[PDB]
Amino acid sequence: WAFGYMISRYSYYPQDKVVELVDIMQKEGFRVAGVFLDIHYMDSYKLFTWHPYRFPEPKKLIDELHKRNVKLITIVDHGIRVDQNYSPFLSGMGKFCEIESGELFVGKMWPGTTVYPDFFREDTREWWAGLISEWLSQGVDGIWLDMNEPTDFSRAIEIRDVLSSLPVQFRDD
Amino acid sequence: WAFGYMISRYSYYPQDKVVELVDIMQKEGFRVAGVFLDIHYMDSYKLFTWHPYRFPEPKKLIDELHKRNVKLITIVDHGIRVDQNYSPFLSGMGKFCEIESGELFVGKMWPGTTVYPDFFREDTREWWAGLISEWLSQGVDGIWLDMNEPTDFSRAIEIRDVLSSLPVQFRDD
């Protein structure tokens, strides 16, 4: 099924619209293997969360798609939001990337202020495998890893904050 | 009396404070020849006007000073406010400075957007003498001509508008 026809967008939501689209596609003769859910499904772009208003019933969305024999692939970025009450941030503590001087490397990504897991470490990898596994247990069929160059926007945003007033064009680097 | 002791500030107001200060000065033994009134006495820095709240009764102030044997000198700048209902602007039309291309030279001064009388012309001088004479007829004893280099702030303000939010220090030219 991974080689079947996949429909995706940035992004499809709320959950009822996702199912509605799949129905129209199937009703009109298109065999859809799976649908991809982009970052709008998350709560404030926080990894491993469902938007409380767009996806109030993730379990229902999953069963509806499966009843239609359509797989669900969810995007998962690499940025962990620096949030005092965000579980992954608290459980990942100790396994994040640092800078030469010893502090955590704090950057900017979709969630806003973010830190990144140091995947070169074995223990970071086991921690991540656990979150992924837990995420898969809901019935999610695939994982779409994005922005994992790894990409960070802190420098780009820094430049815009300082040279914001100037009516000049920044060189796209 | 022009060589007597003059007290001044930028500025003394409202009108009752002016008289109060003169009284204290005289009561304590200081022979004050005259008092200078700076730009705060005008209405929105408009030449030949009295601030409606700080100087409600100008003739009352003038009589109070004169009976105390004190002269009144009022500052008068060179900028005519570009105002649709400002008399000097309307009566001065035709006698203002222009630029090479033919339009009026519109700049910036205390009143905000302003034009300047072309004093090199005889008719402008006659027009200005008329205003001065009328201003003097209230009992004003002297004229304090300021900013007549002539000075204009349009270029400086222009630089500040464009490079406003830039954390840099402007050279003071």
Swiss-Prot record, chains A, B:
Q: Which family does it belong to?
A: Belongs to the glycosyl hydrolase 31 family.
Q: What is the lineage of its organism?
A: Archaea, Thermoproteota, Thermoprotei, Sulfolobales, Sulfolobaceae
The compartments listed are: Cytoplasm
Q: Per its database record, what is this protein's job?
A: Major soluble alpha-glucosidase.
Return the protein name. Answer: Alpha-glucosidase
The annotated active site, in chain numbering, is D146, E149
